[PDB]
Amino acid sequence: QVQLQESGPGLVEPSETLSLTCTVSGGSISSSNWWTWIRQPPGKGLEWIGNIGGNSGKTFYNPSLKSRVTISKDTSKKQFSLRLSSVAAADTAVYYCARHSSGYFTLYALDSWGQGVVVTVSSASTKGPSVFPLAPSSKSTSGGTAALGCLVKDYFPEPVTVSWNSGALTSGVHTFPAVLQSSGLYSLSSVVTVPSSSLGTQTYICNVNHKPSNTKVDKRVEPKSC
Amino acid sequence: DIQMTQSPSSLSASVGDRVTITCRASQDISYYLAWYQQKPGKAPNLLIYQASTLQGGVPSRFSGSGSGTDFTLTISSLQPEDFATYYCQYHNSDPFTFGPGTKLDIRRTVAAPSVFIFPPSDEQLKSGTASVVCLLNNFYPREAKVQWKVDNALQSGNSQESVTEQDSKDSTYSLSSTLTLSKADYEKHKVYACEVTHQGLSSPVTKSFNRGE
């Protein structure tokens, strides 16, 4: 049935306007659904922003945002949109689109959701990561197990994603939440444990994706040469 | 309009348990209460709406009850992948208020960490900074203490740490601690060591290396 794909910028500067768009497949915008926007500030719970009736175009907005929020829809483009004007640091949040299903006289709930867009409000500039290897060695080996990884450092804003060998290596992978350094940039590590007997035969490559900078970087991770 | 509260704010339970969490509305909302599961880093998933209607595709072990102001979500036969934050929501009129969430962790037997240390790469050193990484793998409970020592001098103020979410099968955590120094400071010292204390360890574990080996 309905599937939702969200789009929009990862970084907005204060006092500017944030715009997000959701593209719908499996159904018409013009329908008894209420197309919805939700956000989640860092460390906090979920907050309903507002909705728009797919057929009627009636909009409802959260009173803590209504003067700055506008929701609109375009059936011929299979999309609906959110505009948040005069953004401030407190609008930093993950933003979601969702489908609120309806009955004839009462509503059901948010049964379909977009994947979320991480939005940061800041005057700092976007910066892609530097990727450094965490090489396997004797001091990263336990039994027949070796740990290795990638240090993804000095990027802004969130998020980055990491896969290993294009997603063919998932067992034993740990990608840690990012920390905010005193420089104002983020840093995370991704590690994987593998058979020690594979270091001489198998290639290990971390694929780092930072969409706010359109950065994709593949880093080979090998034992050192001392 | 509507204020929503949830209780407890967090709990742990064991695989196989039947666990109940609660939601209360500050006003009568009839049965127009929904429950969502939110995994770390993901959009929420609807579990229940109209207080007790199970959404299609959701496992049979989730159920809800209640009407008026007091509601409950019950997870029977609790599974290790059921760790999450659970949110209630008034789903029939604006502002469609969500509760504050209830964080559910899965309880298991104590497991000591495997500890690994990574010297800075030559690449990073060329840039003038040195990051030393200490990794604690697959331990339980979450609480661990990592102390850095450089030539047997306790460090403070120059490291940060991060912890993964629970593993959806074995319910363990992993933790990464990074010590950050300048290239020049890093080249002034020999022995770099991560010291780890944890409920599953009889004495602290120290993993170390000599710079340039």
Binding site: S30, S32, W34, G53, G54, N55, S56, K58, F60, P63, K66, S102, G103, Y104, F105, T106, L107 | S93, D94
Partner: peptide
């Protein structure tokens, strides 16, 4: 400001 009621739900079935 107007609140979403059963008339709004019902009206959104038309067109």
């Amino acid at each position: 400001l107007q609140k979403l009621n059963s008339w709004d739900v019902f009206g959104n079935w038309f067109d």
